[PDB]
Structure 1
Amino acid sequence: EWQENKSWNAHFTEHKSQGVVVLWNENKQQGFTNNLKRANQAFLPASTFKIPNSLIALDLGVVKDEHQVFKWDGQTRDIATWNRDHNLITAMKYSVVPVYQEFARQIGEARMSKMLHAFDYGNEDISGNVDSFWLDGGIRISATEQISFLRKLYHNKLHVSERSQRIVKQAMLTEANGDYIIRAKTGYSTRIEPKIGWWVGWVELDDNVWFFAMNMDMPTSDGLGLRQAITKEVLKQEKIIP
């Protein structure tokens, strides 16, 4: 069911880094990774948590739809794209933490915890502050657990409405051309060691879907572009994308 392909380690060592890529071939129900142990090691989800957070906020009515505007609070932060109004689409695209912190406050601890259990999401543990637990609280998830969750989302099998899942999958749209569609979400965890980057999502082809989840050590923000670049080199090597 899971097979290790250590040839992919070259894509990490080429960049003097370390990490794991996990792929899942949906038609064949077969998984692949360069590192079985790290594929099952759990880390802070950081901004990959915007996927479950979006789903919960929509299903509870905290977010009406993907057009509702969440006004900038006027506090200047160091990420320029955060100092502006957002909707769900752009808040996902620019990983706008303060928007999702307000979602979380309105969801509240009780509803957040029971929905993460309903989702079977990671260790289902929201200990810490309700508006930051995915950045520095007790929640943890592994790359293989991200795949499990994403497959449910793809198939509309999570315990929220079909509408909520369709909207979040729209908001995950990252790249599309004549050859493939990628729906995905980045993450960057810095508040507890080891600092890591995430990229989780899937690749839609004409006649198959490949789910993926990767994380990698990220000692500085200068390497963030490697999250997508390394994943895409693996996809290219496996002839999943040109």
Structure 2
Amino acid sequence: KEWQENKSWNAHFTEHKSQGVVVLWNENKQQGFTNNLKRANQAFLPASTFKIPNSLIALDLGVVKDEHQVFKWDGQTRDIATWNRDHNLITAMKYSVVPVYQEFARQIGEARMSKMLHAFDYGNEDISGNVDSFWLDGGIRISATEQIFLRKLYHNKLHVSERSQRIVKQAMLTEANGDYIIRAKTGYDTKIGWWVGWVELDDNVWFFAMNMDMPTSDGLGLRQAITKEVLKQEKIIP
């Protein structure tokens, strides 16, 4: 009753010769839905969805002063054109600028990063590996249901200031029109791709967390596209 399985959504993954899970949470009804109950609770690397807690920690420790502070390009020409420029928290989130967040993580340091993830109840709370890459290739793991962390963020219940939480929710802003607002973050670890966040409507909020097998970055647009198809199927968005 609290959780309900809907395998019809599998078609949206197999339509694209893929495999994955979408988890939805209806906040007003306190009811969850997914196409795959097992996979909804399997833990994966968070990859760049880790930018959500990393941002909160950087803000609350004063590593980042506000969303306007500029992190200047380090002058290394990288493969992603939008990384080769100055950023602030907003644009760094938007373009998933790993080198900016690696600098945050080094400033934060291991002892504080670990304490804060413990305080967040975030995934397996394990930062084994490099302090500035463990969310990409170290020991940290989180499941889709565990990402649905987001409910605490939404309600300002995380163990960081309300201000830090409002700034990160602002930075997560992805889309808005007269029908809905999406606040979310993508991630990709070269094997699975993520999209996690929520959809704000006039009278409700739907939290989502999706991950999918993702051999190639050619199909990264499928993270949003598959998720939106489910949302349209469920009459959450038009």
With normalisation by structure 2, the TM-score equals 0.99
Q: Distance in 2 between matches of 1:53 and 1:14?
A: 34
Q: CA deviation at 1:26?
A: 0.1
Q: CA deviation at 1:104?
A: 0.1
SS in 1 for 2:123: coil
Q: CA deviation at 1:97?
A: 0.1
The percentage of counterpart residues that share the same residue type is 100
Deviations 1:25-82 (A, max 9, x none): 0000000000000001110000000000000000000000000000010011100000
Deviations 1:76-113 (A, max 9, x none): 11000000000000000000000000000000000000
Q: CA deviation at 1:10?
A: 0.5
Task: Please point out which of 191, 194, 197 is paired with 1:198.
Answer: 194
| 1:87-236 paired onto structure 2 within 5 Å | 87-147=88-148, 149-190=149-190, 195-236=191-232
Q: CA deviation at 1:17?
A: 0.1
Q: Distance in 1 between matches of 2:70 and 2:116?
A: 24
Q: Distance in 2 between matches of 1:177 and 1:17?
A: 30
With normalisation by structure 1, the TM-score equals 0.98
Number of residue equivalences: 237
Q: CA deviation at 1:145?
A: 0.3
Aligned to 2:58: 57
Gapped regions of structure 1 (runs ≥ 5): none
Deviations 1:210-231 (A, max 9, x none): 0000000001011100000000
Q: Distance in 2 between matches of 1:158 and 1:5?
A: 31
Q: CA deviation at 1:240?
A: 0.1
CA RMSD of the aligned region, Å? 0.3
Gapped regions of structure 2 (runs ≥ 5): none
Q: Distance in 1 between matches of 2:77 and 2:213?
A: 29
SS in 1 for 2:182: strand
Q: CA deviation at 1:134?
A: 0.3
SS in 1 for 2:128: coil
Q: CA deviation at 1:207?
A: 0.4
Q: Which runs of 4+ in 1 moved over 3 A?
A: none
Q: CA deviation at 1:18?
A: 0.0
SS in 1 for 2:159: coil
Q: Distance in 1 between matches of 2:43 and 2:15?
A: 24
SS in 1 for 2:174: strand
Q: Distance in 2 between matches of 1:182 and 1:189?
A: 23
